[PDB]
Amino acid sequence: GAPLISVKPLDNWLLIYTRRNYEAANSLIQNLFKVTPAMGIQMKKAIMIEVDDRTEAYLRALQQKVTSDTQIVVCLLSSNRKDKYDAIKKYLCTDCPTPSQCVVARTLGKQQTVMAIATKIALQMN
Amino acid sequence: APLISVKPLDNWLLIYTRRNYEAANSLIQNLFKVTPAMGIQMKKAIMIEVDDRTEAYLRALQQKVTSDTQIVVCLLSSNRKDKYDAIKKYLCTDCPTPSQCVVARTLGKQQTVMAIATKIALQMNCK
């Protein structure tokens, strides 16, 4: 036979992060692996993009890596630094057609933060 | 004391223009119908009538969106690209509260209603 239960594969997506948060990025992938089956989603590993911690490096990585095939984009930020956050958000929102979201590394400890992120992804996949 | 847990949706905004006053009322009623199956207990939206121009939508947003606002829904007279794009962009850059735009025309389907409610159930779990 072959599966009967609907899943949605999340196989092509970007996680853009800065070296200081290398391990909070890895943990996020694992955690999302845990909560994602309950939501009808089958996850592959994110395409991971390490950038210098500056606005412009995030934006470059965006212009170079986002494709037709990219399903979701997640920008992990070192900090809730208003200007950096606002300038990435503005660009994703005007220039990036691919659904996206920003996350501040700090909040990542919490399992409610993880759930919210996955929820937003489930949402963007429709 | 009532044992089944429900997510109350008691503070939220519907911004619409006078021409779609009734399509707006209907949308509330219909959402009342399909929302209990999703674990949500709905109150009526705070309804905000605005003139049919981009800027009027944006003023309403700046004035009425609060810490308490759970969801924002902008119902548009038309799929007019510029108006739709400008409102979408602004919500997306300047409005932290989760939101969506709906074109009145499409409200004439129970699949449209389901999609909006689905999106809301989803937005009720976000940071």
Numbering used by the authors:
A (entry chain C): 485 to 610
B (entry chain A): 486 to 612
Original authors' sentences:
Argonautes can be classified into two major clades: AGO and PIWI. The PIWI clade, on the other hand, is restricted to animals and further confined to the gonads, often displaying strong sex-specific expression patterns. Argonautes are structurally organized into N-terminal, PAZ, middle (MID), and PIWI domains.
The overall structure of the MIWI MID domain reveals a Rossmann fold composed of alternating β-strands and α-helices that form a pocket capable of accommodating a single nucleotide. The MIWI MID domain is characterized by a core four-stranded β-sheet flanked by four α-helices. Comparison of the MIWI MID-UMP docking structure to that of hAgo2 MID-UMP shows that a group of conserved residues allow interaction with the 5′ phosphate group (MIWI residues: Y569, K573, Q585, and K604) and stacking of the base with a tyrosine (Y569 in MIWI). The specificity loop in MIWI MID lacks prolines and is consequently more flexible, explaining the repositioning of the base. Thus, our docking studies suggest that the MIWI MID domain can optimally accommodate a 5′ uridine in the nucleotide-binding pocket, conferring an inherent ability to the protein in accumulating 1U-containing RNAs.
